[PDB]
From a paper:
[name] inhibitors are among the most prominent categories of compounds in the drug market and are categorized into the class of traditional NSAIDs that inhibit both [name]‐1 and [name]‐2, as well as into the class of [name]‐2‐specific inhibitors, referred to as coxibs. [name]‐1 dominates prostanoid formation in monocytes and platelets, with the latter exclusively expressing [name]‐1 but not [name]‐2. [name]‐1 crystallizes as a homodimer in the asymmetric unit, consisting of two ≈72 kDa subunits tightly packed against each other via an extensive binding interface of ≈2500 Å2. Previous studies have revealed that small‐molecule NSAIDs interact with the proximal and central inhibitor binding side of [name], which both overlap with the binding pocket for arachidonic acid.
To determine the binding mode and rationalize these biochemical effects, we determined the crystal structure of the ovine [name]‐1 (oCOX‐1) in complex with the subtype‐selective derivative 2a (oCOX‐1 IC50 = 0.160 ± 0.001 µm, inactive on hCOX‐2). Compound 2a was identified in an unbiased Fo–Fc polder map within the oCOX‐1 hydrophobic channel between residues Arg120 and Tyr355. The methoxyacetate residue of compound 2a was the only part of the molecule that did not have a clear density in the crystal structure, possibly underscoring its flexibility and lack of binding interactions. The crystal structure revealed that the inhibitor resided in the active site of the enzyme in an almost planar conformation. Compound 2a bound to the substrate channel with one chlorobenzene facing Ser530, and another chlorobenzene facing down near residues Tyr355 and Arg120, the entry point to the active site. The ligand was engaged in two sets of interactions with oCOX‐1 residues, namely a hydrogen bridge between a chlorine atom of the ligand and the hydroxyl group of residue Ser530, and multiple non‐bonded van der Waals and hydrophobic contacts with 19 oCOX‐1 residues. The ligand portion in the distal binding pocket was surrounded by hydrophobic residues (Leu531, Leu534, Leu535, Ile345, Met113) and formed van der Waals interactions with Lys360. All three compounds interacted with the catalytic Ser530 and structurally overlapped in this central part, whereas compound 2a adopted an inverted orientation, occupying a hydrophobic protein pocket lined by residues Met113, Val116, Ile345, Lys360, Leu531, Leu534, and Leu535. This binding pose mimics the bound state of the endogenous substrate arachidonic acid. Compound 2a inhibited [name]‐1 independently of the arachidonic acid concentration in a highly potent manner, which was confirmed in wash‐out experiments indicating tight binding.
Residue numbers in the entry:
A (entry chain A), B (entry chain B): 32 to 584
Amino acid sequence: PVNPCCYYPCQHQGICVRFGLDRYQCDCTRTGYSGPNCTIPEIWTWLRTTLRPSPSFIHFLLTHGRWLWDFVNATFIRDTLMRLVLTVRSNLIPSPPTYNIAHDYISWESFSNVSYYTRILPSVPRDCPTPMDTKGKKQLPDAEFLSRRFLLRRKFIPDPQSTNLMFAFFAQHFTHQFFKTSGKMGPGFTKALGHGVDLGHIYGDNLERQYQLRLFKDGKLKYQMLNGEVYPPSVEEAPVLMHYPRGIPPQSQMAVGQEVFGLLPGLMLYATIWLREHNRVCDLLKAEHPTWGDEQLFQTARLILIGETIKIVIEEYVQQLSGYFLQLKFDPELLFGAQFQYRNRIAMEFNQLYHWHPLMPDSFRVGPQDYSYEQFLFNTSMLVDYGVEALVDAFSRQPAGRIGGGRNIDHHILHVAVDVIKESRVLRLQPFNEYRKRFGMKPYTSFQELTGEKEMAAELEELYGDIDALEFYPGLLLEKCHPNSIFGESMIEMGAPFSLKGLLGNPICSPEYWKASTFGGEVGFNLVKTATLKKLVCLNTKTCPYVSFHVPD
Amino acid sequence: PVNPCCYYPCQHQGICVRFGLDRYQCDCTRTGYSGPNCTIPEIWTWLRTTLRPSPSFIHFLLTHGRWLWDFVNATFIRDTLMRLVLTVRSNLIPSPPTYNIAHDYISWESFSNVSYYTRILPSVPRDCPTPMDTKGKKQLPDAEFLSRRFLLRRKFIPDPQSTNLMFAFFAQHFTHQFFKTSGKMGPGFTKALGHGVDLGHIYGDNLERQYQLRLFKDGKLKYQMLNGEVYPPSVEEAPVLMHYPRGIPPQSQMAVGQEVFGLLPGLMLYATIWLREHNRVCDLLKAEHPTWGDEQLFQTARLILIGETIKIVIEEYVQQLSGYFLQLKFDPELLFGAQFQYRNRIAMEFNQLYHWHPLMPDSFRVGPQDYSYEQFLFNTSMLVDYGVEALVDAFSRQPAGRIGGGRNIDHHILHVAVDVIKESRVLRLQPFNEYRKRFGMKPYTSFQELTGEKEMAAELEELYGDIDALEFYPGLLLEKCHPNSIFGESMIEMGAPFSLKGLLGNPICSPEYWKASTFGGEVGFNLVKTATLKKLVCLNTKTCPYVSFHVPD
Ligand code: HEM
Ligand code: HEM
Ligand SMILES: C=CCc1cccc(-c2nc(-c3ccccc3Cl)c(-c3ccccc3Cl)[nH]2)c1OC(=O)COC
Ligand SMILES: C=CCc1cccc(-c2nc(-c3ccccc3Cl)c(-c3ccccc3Cl)[nH]2)c1OC(=O)COC
Ligand SMILES: *[C@@H]1O[C@H](CO)[C@@H](O[C@@H]2O[C@H](CO)[C@@H](O)[C@H](O)[C@H]2NC(C)=O)[C@H](O)[C@H]1NC(C)=O
Ligand SMILES: *[C@@H]1O[C@H](CO)[C@@H](O[C@@H]2O[C@H](CO)[C@@H](O)[C@H](O)[C@H]2NC(C)=O)[C@H](O)[C@H]1NC(C)=O
Ligand SMILES: *[C@@H]1O[C@H](CO)[C@@H](O[C@@H]2O[C@H](CO)[C@@H](O)[C@H](O)[C@H]2NC(C)=O)[C@H](O)[C@H]1NC(C)=O
Ligand SMILES: *[C@@H]1O[C@H](CO)[C@@H](O[C@@H]2O[C@H](CO)[C@@H](O)[C@H](O)[C@H]2NC(C)=O)[C@H](O)[C@H]1NC(C)=O
Ligand SMILES: *[C@@H]1O[C@H](CO)[C@@H](O[C@@H]2O[C@H](CO)[C@@H](O)[C@H](O)[C@H]2NC(C)=O)[C@H](O)[C@H]1NC(C)=O
Ligand SMILES: *[C@@H]1O[C@H](CO)[C@@H](O[C@@H]2O[C@H](CO)[C@@H](O)[C@H](O)[C@H]2NC(C)=O)[C@H](O)[C@H]1NC(C)=O
């Protein structure tokens, strides 16, 4: 007999539980609905679902009518809206987390073992006809064909929100502290056990690595001086595992918390910036805390950098990403009243969702010169030759590509997208519309509705056979984008829960941690509270270049 | 200069932060007080502290006036009070946890690294005159002398609350899943990374161990049949590390989740009981879930046993320990409204606090026979000869010793108390009265007030020199006990925060987990909801012996 839980029968977060040979029952417990399939709303849930605005309508409000929003930003209405949206966007994420790749059920091993990526929706049961559901073809479309036809960039499409490469490298840099898939244990496992904003891309993902990187004097990190400017230490001075081209002299390498940051200068640029910041923070502490030691200095400086990392992400990174006129504000006290679980677990859906390779351009413009990918990647000497200032300026001045819409991934990095479609199929993710339903949206009824256009939609229908059999990763990048937006509706509504939960779920936002003593006096607490991207870049350089997440007008 | 933070200047959970060469400042942030030392109450906090009853007065209410309490139990006043107790006894424990042995400050390493025992109060700073504070002698009293004089049992003093050995072995069994100090890494570190009710004393503390113990058929654990009764497998069948006397035949050893349970029959008795229950739970699940596998069966049976473990501890274990007329009830939904962090971290203070070796008697009476310690401990064949039923009956009928008051630890196990006083000094715990202040009690003003008697108080004053220099572990056991109670005021107010946080901090109590699907249908959910000690013992035996936490009248 067929497995009933492959029809995805239960809506609104109902849990499909098999009884007997061919039956099922669903736990609509605390789902807000009732019935065999949890399709009968309770009195309040119906009240909510009727008085709701549509997600496209709310993007309209938040991206139009500035006069109203400038008034709302300067009044308390922001804080209430901050709480409103802040307290709402996190309820879609199970906490404590539920599932992982091996377990499609709540289990103690899925909770204790932090090496698993957690999961929002259970996997497609293995005993079912189509690889996605009861629906669709019996074979999935070729991954490399899908990419070469729909995700491959043909002409550079820039981000209409002015996003620059300075932003994209931060996204790569910032998100490679919790997205570190271990090739040895296979997809679905993670090396980054911090499972959040731990700055494990700076201080490494284990004690052994940070000890080799720490200078053990005044809490600082080891470093080297090239051209009179501070740079991270060479692998010779700091003997840590690094992924570098063979035969590269081990005095031109550099040691950082993330093994991979040597492969792009933009990532090492950020690692350089954070190290200078850390050592600068350590200098301020020792000035006001003469009696402290190396561990005391280091750990407090870490928390400071963690704090001002989250600050910059909320109020400048997400602020740019959303296009919202509602001023986003980092204030942990907004969640002190609500029941909030201060702990995160990276979900494999967040990993798939966050692959923003379309941000990368056709080639990299650094002032007068134009470096190709072969001429840019792996360049061990590019950062030192140009200096932090010139590279930060060059990236901030160069546009970055749009994420959504499709056909905007450069051919050099397209082999990632194919391996991601392959990975999505091996992890056995549920189809796209099922993730829409789980994230408070109605399923798309046809590919024409998805893409909002006729040619590429009709072909997709020929490959997949049915909209309900669409995959997760292809659907996100091919969805019609919001008007003059960087990516479409689904990427907003699905990534926003994970990102919020991962930034405000950090323990420093908790009531027990978010106090001035946690940061060794008010100096640290105000460094976190008043942090900006411009400050982080210009306080650690001899000059102040143009730094922002958007190109100048 | 002297370290100012050794005067313990800041009260009411104020954090001492050193500035400069010889200054300090305190973060009274969210402490409810104000001032340099957080001694100036706010309007509400003063309102609370004046309308407070004394802890001895509330014990009077909860242990007298049965007519009132029987009425309160059958009405909603129980549930409202349950919330009250839940929201009061849990706020004193930092979550996320703050300190550990190496770090006397909030740090990212103390949060991530689960091998550390966490901590409530920072260690006594190393640069200060006396080992406890600015106060007291320059040398602490000899630990072995303190034990032989004040903690050594002279005549068996029984528990006036009727506590039996059946209770005490459960306390040892239940609490050896989170109290597993690693001898290799030294005091202050833990092998039990679950840090709570993970039943790691049944399923081992790592995947390698549980796989060797699991039978991998219908989710069951391996086992062996002796005399027609189920017993845990011999080390030969299940090859896991065990601590056993040398040369003992391996087909007479037994393999369990906790390496140490072979050294006492009472501990192995409980492990036997839990295993039979686990395999019985696995039988019920397979009956209703034919399509499930070994991993699916096993993990759900684990959660069921975890649930009914917590149920038995709250409604029967603590019920016995407290003597409260208010019937305590296990209901996670009582905390759904409050902001409750569903995560625990074992505190080294809880480890010191729960060393209840006074419960152990002079000799163990098993029906007609009376086994000495040498004749009882390490007895590889005692459990199988007498059978589970006869031992459960024998222990429930035999009284257990009182914990508090002092001079009630048997000489066989007194070397533990000595090593605990040594361990407390190595971990560098703050003096007793400082823990009273941190746990919402006024400090004792003299040793005569502590013990409520004159002889042993005067000697303690001679050894210690000052009440404010009293150690943590001695103070708990020597404190005057509540009238006709097993232990005194301090053990109540200090243990209840850790115990409550560790049982209801288990994720299964969270809203995300506490549903019927988490236990594979209503059968699992009702096994958890209706669990009792009598059921756990008699459902897994051919006969039902006398099982209880109290001797018969
Ligand atoms: C030239 C630019 C880039 C290059 C060369 C590059 C390269 C790679 C490679 C080789 C992988 C491994 C995928 C696999 O082996 O299947 C990867 C994964 C990933 N990429 Fe990129 N990438 C670039 C830009 C970006 C950007 C701008 C983002 C923005 C978010 C991003 C996000 C990610 C993430 C989150 C992963 C997951 C890593 C993991 O799961 O361990 N990448 N990238
Ligand atoms: C015959 C009865 C008992 C024996 C033989 C025994 C034996 C031991 C031993 C040898 C230690 C190690 C201490 C050290 O090495 O410094 C220990 C620790 C401990 N004992 Fe017992 N004990 C008994 C009864 C109890 C009881 C009734 C309790 C009730 C709570 C208890 C609670 C503990 C705890 C919590 C630890 C801490 C273990 C750790 O920190 O790793 N013990 N016991
Ligand atoms: C106080 C602030 C609350 C708060 C804290 C921390 C993070 C967020 C956050 N927002 C968003 C977001 C929201 C709406 C529209 C667009 C975006 Cl990109 C995202 C996100 C979504 C998808 C992919 C990636 C990301 Cl990073 N993550 C966050 O929410 C916001 O600040 C904006 O929404 C109110
Ligand atoms: C829904 C119930 C919440 C709840 C769950 C789980 C455990 C507890 C708990 N209580 C106590 C306790 C509390 C007051 C007086 C006496 C005791 Cl022995 C203890 C404890 C204290 C000291 C040493 C050891 C222990 Cl085990 N542990 C608990 O708290 C209570 O039920 C009673 O609190 C007034
Ligand atoms: C809940 O959803 C399930 C699956 O979508 C529905 O079950 C199907 O019902 C149709 C209508 O008779 C049958 O033709 C299918 O054979 C059923 N499939 C399965 C697996 O049972 C069910 O009807 C829905 N519940 C309600 C009340 O409508
Ligand atoms: C977390 O889980 C993974 C996989 O479940 C564990 O790694 C596996 O352990 C088993 C048995 O020890 C081995 O047979 C596998 O070869 C290991 N690797 C993989 C990819 O499965 C890992 O040990 C667990 N981590 C912890 C702390 O328990
Ligand atoms: C790494 O980048 C450096 C620039 O710092 C490249 O060297 C430049 O190469 C361009 C032509 O590609 C010349 O116009 C510049 O004069 C060179 N500058 C220096 C200092 O050499 C270098 O070619 C890049 N490495 C790789 C492998 O492409
Ligand atoms: C906070 O507590 C500290 C320590 O008890 C107080 O410092 C003492 O103050 C008394 C009276 O001023 C002096 O006699 C002692 O010499 C001080 N001891 C030290 C180490 O400085 C301090 O006064 C308290 N703060 C307030 C406002 O009362
Ligand atoms: C947790 O912390 C402990 C102690 O800091 C770490 O164990 C020590 O690691 C250092 C460096 O690797 C060694 O020099 C010590 O000998 C180790 N043992 C002790 C008792 O210090 C441990 O590695 C950390 N665990 C994690 C997951 O980070
Ligand atoms: C382990 O306990 C067993 C009881 O099951 C002990 O054997 C008994 O010993 C007593 C005297 O101590 C005799 O009266 C009984 O006849 C014995 N019964 C059996 C079946 O042998 C045994 O001595 C204990 N082991 C140790 C090391 O003390």
